[PDB]
Amino acid sequence: AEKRTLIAVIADEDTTTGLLLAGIGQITPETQEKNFFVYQEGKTTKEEITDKFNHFTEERDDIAILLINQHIAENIRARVDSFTNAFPAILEIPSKDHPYDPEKDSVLKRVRKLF
Amino acid sequence: VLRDRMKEILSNAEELEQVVQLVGKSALSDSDKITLDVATLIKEDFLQQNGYSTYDAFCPIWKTFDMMRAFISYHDEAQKAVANGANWSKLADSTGDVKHAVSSSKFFEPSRGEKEVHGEFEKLLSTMQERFAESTD
Amino acid sequence: VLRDRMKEILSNAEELEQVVQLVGKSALSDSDKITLDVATLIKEDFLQQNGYSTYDAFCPIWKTFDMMRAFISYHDEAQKAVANGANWSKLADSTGDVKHAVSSSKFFEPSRGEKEVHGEFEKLLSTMQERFAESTD
Amino acid sequence: VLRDRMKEILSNAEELEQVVQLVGKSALSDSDKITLDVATLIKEDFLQQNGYSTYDAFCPIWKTFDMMRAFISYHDEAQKAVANGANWSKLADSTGDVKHAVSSSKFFEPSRGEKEVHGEFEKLLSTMQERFAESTD
Amino acid sequence: EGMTRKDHGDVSNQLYAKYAIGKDAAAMKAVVGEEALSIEDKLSLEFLEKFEKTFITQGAYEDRTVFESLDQAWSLLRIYPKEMLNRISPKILDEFY
Amino acid sequence: EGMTRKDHGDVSNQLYAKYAIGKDAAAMKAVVGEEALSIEDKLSLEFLEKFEKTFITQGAYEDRTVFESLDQAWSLLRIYPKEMLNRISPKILDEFY
Amino acid sequence: EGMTRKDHGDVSNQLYAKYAIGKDAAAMKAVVGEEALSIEDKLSLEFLEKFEKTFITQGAYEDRTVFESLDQAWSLLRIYPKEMLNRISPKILDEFY
Amino acid sequence: VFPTRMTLGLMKTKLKGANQGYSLLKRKSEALTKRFRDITKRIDDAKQKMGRVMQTAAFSLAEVSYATGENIGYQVQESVSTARFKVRARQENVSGVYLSQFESYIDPEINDFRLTGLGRGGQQVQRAKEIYSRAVETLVELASLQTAFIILDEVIKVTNRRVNAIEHVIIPRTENTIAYINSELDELDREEFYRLKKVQEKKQNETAKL
Q: Does C23 touch chain H if contact means CB atoms closer than 8 Å? A: yes
Amino acid at B68: M
- Cβ neighbours of A114 in B, within 8 Å: 22-24
Q: Label residue B32 exposed, middle or buried (CB < 10 Å: 0-12, 13-18, 19+).
A: buried
Q: What is the CA radius of gyration of chain G?
A: 15
**How far apart, in whole angstroms, are the C-alpha atoms of residue F46 and residue F40?**
11
Contact E48, C6 (CB under 8 A): no
Amino acid at F6: K
The residue in chain H having the minimum alpha-carbon distance to the alpha carbon of residue A68 is H51
Asked whether the beta carbons of residue C24 and residue E37 sit closer than 8 angstroms, the reply is yes
Closest by CA position to A8, among listed A51, A76, A66: A66
| Residue H18, min C-alpha distance to chain D (Å) | 13
**How far apart, in whole angstroms, are the C-alpha atoms of residue B105 and residue B83?**
29
DSSP state of A10: E
**Which of H158, H160, H163, H174 to mutate against chain E (most E CBs within 10 Å)?**
H158
**How far apart, in whole angstroms, are the C-alpha atoms of residue A50 and residue A76?**
6
**How far apart, in whole angstroms, are the C-alpha atoms of residue D81 and residue E31?**
30
Q: How crowded is residue H155: how many other Cβ atoms within 10 Å of its Cβ?
A: 20
**How far apart, in whole angstroms, are the C-alpha atoms of residue A99 and residue A70?**
10
Does the bond joining H3 to the residue before it have cis omega, within 30 degrees of 0? Answer: no
Q: Return all residues near B33 (Cβ < 8 A) that are at least 6 apart.
A: B88
* Paired strand residues for C61: none
Length of chain G: 97
Please report the DSSP string for chain D in residue order. Answer: -HHHHHHHHHHHHHHHHHHHHHT-STTS-HHHHHHHHHHHHHIIIII----SSSTTT---HHHHHHHHHHHHHHHHHHHHHHHTS--HHHHHHHHHHHHHHHHGGGTS-SS-BTTTB-HHHHHHHHHHHHHHHHHH-
Closest by CA position to A60, among listed A106, A2, A3, A17: A3
| F30, F33, F34: residue with CB nearest C16 | F30
**How far apart, in whole angstroms, are the C-alpha atoms of residue D34 and residue A43?**
44
Q: Does A86 touch chain B if contact means CB atoms closer than 8 Å? A: no
Cα angle for residues G78, G83, G85 (degrees, 5° grid): 40
CA D67, distance to chain mean position in Å, is 8
Contact H163, H106 (CB under 8 A): no
| Residue A38, min C-alpha distance to chain H (Å) | 9
**How far apart, in whole angstroms, are the C-alpha atoms of residue H40 and residue B54?**
52
Contact D78, D91 (CB under 8 A): yes
Own/partner long-range contacts of D71-75 (Cβ < 8 Å, ≥24 apart): D71/D38, D71/D41, D71/D42, D71/D45, D71/D102, D72/D2, D72/D5, D72/D9, D72/D38, D73/D125, D73/D128, D74/D38, D74/D41, D74/D98, D74/D128, D75/D9, D75/D34, D75/D35, D75/D38
**How far apart, in whole angstroms, are the C-alpha atoms of residue B97 and residue B135?**
13
Quick check: helix, strand or coil at residue B14? helix
Strands H85-94 and H97-106: antiparallel
Contact present, F and H (at least 3 Cβ pairs less than 8 Å)? yes
Q: Label residue C24 exposed, middle or buried (CB < 10 Å: 0-12, 13-18, 19+).
A: buried
Amino acid at F45: L
Ligand-binding annotation for D79, yes or no, is no
Q: How crowded is residue C107: how many other Cβ atoms within 10 Å of its Cβ?
A: 11
Query: Can you say whether residue F6 is alpha, beta or left, with left for phi > 0 and alpha for psi between -120 and 50 degrees?
Result: alpha
Q: Return all residues near C87 (Cβ < 8 A) that are at least 6 apart.
A: C30
Asked whether the beta carbons of residue E35 and residue C26 sit closer than 8 angstroms, the reply is yes
Query: Can you say whether residue H96 is alpha, beta or left, with left for phi > 0 and alpha for psi between -120 and 50 degrees?
Result: left
The residue in chain H having the minimum alpha-carbon distance to the alpha carbon of residue E34 is H158
Q: Does A17 touch chain H if contact means CB atoms closer than 8 Å? A: yes
Quick check: helix, strand or coil at residue A90? strand
**How far apart, in whole angstroms, are the C-alpha atoms of residue A75 and residue F19?**
57
Domain positions in chain D: 1-134
**How far apart, in whole angstroms, are the C-alpha atoms of residue F45 and residue F31?**
13
3-state percent helix, strand, coil for chain F, nearest multiple of 5: 65, 0, 35
**How far apart, in whole angstroms, are the C-alpha atoms of residue B47 and residue B40?**
10
**Which of G10, G28, G85, G86 to mutate against chain D (most D CBs within 10 Å)?**
G86
Greatest pairwise CA separation for chain D in angstroms = 48
Contact B67, B45 (CB under 8 A): yes
Q: Does H161 touch chain D if contact means CB atoms closer than 8 Å? A: yes
Please report the DSSP string for C13-71 in residue order. Answer: HHHHHHHHHHT-SSS--HHHHHHHHHHHHHIIIII---SSSTTT----HHHHHHHHHHH
HEC sequence for chain G: CCCCCCHHHHHHHHHHHHHHHHHHHHHHHHHHCCCCCCHHHHHHHHHHHHHHHHHCCCCCCCCCCHHHHHHHHHHHHCCCCCCCCCCCCHHHHHHCC
**How far apart, in whole angstroms, are the C-alpha atoms of residue C98 and residue C120?**
12
HEC sequence for F56-92: CCCCCCCCCCHHHHHHHHHHHHCCCCHHHCCCCCHHH
* Paired strand residues for H89: H102
Asked whether the beta carbons of residue H72 and residue A105 sit closer than 8 angstroms, the reply is no
Asked whether the beta carbons of residue D27 and residue E34 sit closer than 8 angstroms, the reply is yes
Q: Return all residues near B16 (Cβ < 8 A) that are at least 6 apart.
A: B28, B32, B35, B36
Q: Kindly list the distances between the CA atom of residue C29 and the CA atoms of B83, C16, C98, in Å, as whole numbers in the listed order.
A: 51, 11, 23
**Which of H25, H156, H162, H167 to mutate against chain E (most E CBs within 10 Å)?**
H162
**Which of H168, H171, H173 to mutate against chain G (most G CBs within 10 Å)?**
H168
Asked whether the beta carbons of residue H27 and residue F27 sit closer than 8 angstroms, the reply is yes
Contact A20, A36 (CB under 8 A): yes
Amino acid at H191: E
Asked whether the beta carbons of residue C22 and residue H93 sit closer than 8 angstroms, the reply is no
Closest by CA position to A67, among listed A1, A12, A111: A12
Q: Return all residues near C136 (Cβ < 8 A) that are at least 6 apart.
A: C80, C81, C84, C86
**How far apart, in whole angstroms, are the C-alpha atoms of residue C76 and residue C122?**
17
Own/partner long-range contacts of D43-48 (Cβ < 8 Å, ≥24 apart): D44/D103, D44/G86, D44/G87, D45/D71, D45/D102, D45/D103, D45/D105, D45/D106, D48/G87
Question: Which helix (H) or strand (E) is A38 found in, with range?
Answer: strand A36-39
Q: Return all residues near A36 (Cβ < 8 A) that are at least 6 apart.
A: A8, A9, A10, A11, A16, A19, A20, A25, H77
Domains and CATH numbers, chain H: 5-207 (1.10.287.3240)
Quick check: helix, strand or coil at residue F36? coil
Amino acid at E75: S
Cα angle for residues B27, B33, B38 (degrees, 5° grid): 140
| Residue E62, min C-alpha distance to chain C (Å) | 34
Contact B37, B13 (CB under 8 A): no
Closest by CA position to H85, among listed H102, H107, H101, H110: H107
Contact A84, H150 (CB under 8 A): yes
**How far apart, in whole angstroms, are the C-alpha atoms of residue H151 and residue H99?**
6
DSSP state of A39: E
Contact A63, A8 (CB under 8 A): yes
Asked whether the beta carbons of residue H162 and residue D23 sit closer than 8 angstroms, the reply is yes
Asked whether the beta carbons of residue H31 and residue F27 sit closer than 8 angstroms, the reply is no
HEC sequence for chain H: CCCCCCCHHHHHHHHHHHHHHHHHHHHHHHHHHHHHHHHHHHHHHHHHHHHHHHHHHHHHHHHHHHHHCCCCHHHHHHHCCCCCEEEEEEEEEECCEEEEEEEEEECCCCCCCCCCCCCHHHHHHHHHHHHHHHHHHHHHHHHHHHHHHHHHHHHHHHHHHHHHHHHHHHHHHHHHHHHHHHHHHHHHHHHHHHHHHHHHHHHHHHHHHC
Quick check: helix, strand or coil at residue B84? coil
Question: Which helix (H) or strand (E) is A67 found in, with range?
Answer: strand A63-69
Q: How many CA atoms lie within 13 A of H18 on its CB side?
A: 19
Asked whether the beta carbons of residue H165 and residue E31 sit closer than 8 angstroms, the reply is yes
Q: Return all residues near A13 (Cβ < 8 A) that are at least 6 apart.
A: A38, A39, A40, H71, H73
Question: Which helix (H) or strand (E) is A9 found in, with range?
Answer: strand A6-12
Q: Does A101 touch chain H if contact means CB atoms closer than 8 Å? A: no
The residue in chain B having the minimum alpha-carbon distance to the alpha carbon of residue H157 is B22
**How far apart, in whole angstroms, are the C-alpha atoms of residue H118 and residue H125?**
9
- Give the sign of the dihedral formed by CA F79, CA F85, CA F90, CA F92: negative
**How far apart, in whole angstroms, are the C-alpha atoms of residue F40 and residue F43?**
6
Asked whether the beta carbons of residue C15 and residue F30 sit closer than 8 angstroms, the reply is yes
| Residue H25, min C-alpha distance to chain D (Å) | 14
Question: Which helix (H) or strand (E) is B31 found in, with range?
Answer: helix B30-42
**How far apart, in whole angstroms, are the C-alpha atoms of residue A6 and residue H199?**
90
Contact D20, G24 (CB under 8 A): no
DSSP state of A4: -
Q: How crowded is residue E45: how many other Cβ atoms within 10 Å of its Cβ?
A: 15
Instruction: Tell me phi and psi for residue H101, to 5 degrees.
Output: -130, 160
Contact G19, G56 (CB under 8 A): no
| Residue E35, min C-alpha distance to chain H (Å) | 9
Q: How crowded is residue A113: how many other Cβ atoms within 10 Å of its Cβ?
A: 15
Q: What is the CA radius of gyration of chain D?
A: 16
**How far apart, in whole angstroms, are the C-alpha atoms of residue D28 and residue D24?**
7
Q: Return all residues near C119 (Cβ < 8 A) that are at least 6 apart.
A: C113
- Cβ neighbours of H129 in A, within 8 Å: 21-22
Asked whether the beta carbons of residue D22 and residue E34 sit closer than 8 angstroms, the reply is no
Q: Does D47 touch chain H if contact means CB atoms closer than 8 Å? A: no
Cα angle for residues G89, G90, G91 (degrees, 5° grid): 90
| C22, C50, C107: residue with CB nearest E36 | C22
CATH of the domain spanning A1-115: 3.40.50.10580
Q: In what order do the strands lie in the sheet containing A63-69?
A: A36-39, A6-12, A63-69, A89-93
**How far apart, in whole angstroms, are the C-alpha atoms of residue D87 and residue D136?**
9
Quick check: helix, strand or coil at residue A7? strand
Q: Kindly list the distances between the CA atom of residue B86 and the CA atoms of B95, B124, B130, C70, in Å, as whole numbers in the listed order.
A: 12, 21, 16, 71
- Cβ neighbours of C27 in H, within 8 Å: 28, 93, 96-97
Q: How crowded is residue C27: how many other Cβ atoms within 10 Å of its Cβ?
A: 21
